[PDB]
């Protein structure tokens, strides 16, 4: 059938709230008051730190996994992603 | 960081998570301290108790879940540290001086 | 209207109708079920 089929072959043919303090990002209660106590007083430092130790500090729990990832899902930011210029000269705490 | 800034964070530690099964073995571990030691410093900052105050927000939550939501008495207790409503109805005459049945009638 | 809707309406939803909380726990444990399940894409009809 290969002999026969060889005869037919001639015939098939900038984001504003990224530069915002965490306590004024309009989130829930224990989603914002626990970031500033670990040197994250901005949004730019949260996206560039490893999550396998950030939620495992003795200030953040299990229910904060959603709302940090709720910001991280929409705009296209990644886990531990570097940024070009987040930090301005104005930095403070509470 | 003074301890009066610690307990100020602790007043916003529970205000979203009183509907959750929140026990002392979570509050102590996710604060950086031990099981007992958080209660000794808690007296000198706000003059009140800790293990009753988480109930005091839980019994506050049951009243705002009764004056707004149609959920029964027997299983609001199921999410708030009780295994039945027999004790959960009893302390409400201490906290708000009323019955858990009589609150929704008087508007 | 549904048996599967009755498991969505958990035991903190049914008791305030006038005119069984222990009896439903017996009738589920006889035939192998549970109360308070969270369902999805239900009812498909």
Curated annotation (Swiss-Prot), chain B:
Induction pattern: By paraquat.
Top-level taxon of origin: Bacteria
- List each copy of the HTH araC/xylS-type domain by range: 8-106
Q: What keywords would UniProt list here? A: Activator, Cytoplasm, DNA-binding, Transcription, Transcription regulation
Checking PROSITE patterns in the record gives: HTH_ARAC_FAMILY_1 (PS00041), HTH_ARAC_FAMILY_2 (PS01124)
Cellular component GO terms held in the UniProt record: cytosol
Broad class of the protein's primary localization: cytoplasm
Q: In which compartments does the protein localize?
A: Cytoplasm
Which biological processes are named by the entry's GO terms? regulation of DNA-templated transcription
Which SMART domains does the record associate with it?
HTH_ARAC
- Xref: NCBIfam families: PRK10219.1
Return the protein name.
Answer: Regulatory protein SoxS
From Swiss-Prot, chain C:
Modification after translation is described as: (Microbial infection) ADP-ribosylated on both alpha subunits by the phage T4 protein ModA. ADP-ribosylated on only one of the alpha subunits by the phage T4 protein Alt.
Q: Which domain of life is it from?
A: Bacteria
Q: Which cysteines are joined by disulfide bonds?
A: none
Family label: Belongs to the RNA polymerase alpha chain family.
Q: How does it assemble?
A: Homodimer. The RNAP catalytic core consists of 2 alpha, 1 beta, 1 beta' and 1 omega subunit. When a sigma factor is associated with the core the holoenzyme is formed, which can initiate transcription. Both the N- and C-terminus interact with different regions of transcriptional regulator CRP. The rRNA transcription and antitermination complex (rrnTAC) consists of RNAP, NusA, NusB, NusE (rpsJ), NusG, SubB, ribosomal protein S4, DNA and precursor rRNA; S4 is more flexible than other subunits.
Biological function: DNA-dependent RNA polymerase (RNAP) catalyzes the transcription of DNA into RNA using the four ribonucleoside triphosphates as substrates. This subunit plays an important role in subunit assembly since its dimerization is the first step in the sequential assembly of subunits to form the holoenzyme. Part of the processive rRNA transcription and antitermination complex (rrnTAC). The complex forms an RNA-chaperone ring around the RNA exit tunnel of RNAP. It supports rapid transcription and antitermination of rRNA operons, cotranscriptional rRNA folding, and annealing of distal rRNA regions to allow correct ribosome biogenesis.
Entry's free-text remark on domains: The N-terminal domain is essential for RNAP assembly and basal transcription, whereas the C-terminal domain is involved in interaction with transcriptional regulators (such as CRP) and with upstream promoter elements.
What's the protein here called? DNA-directed RNA polymerase subunit alpha
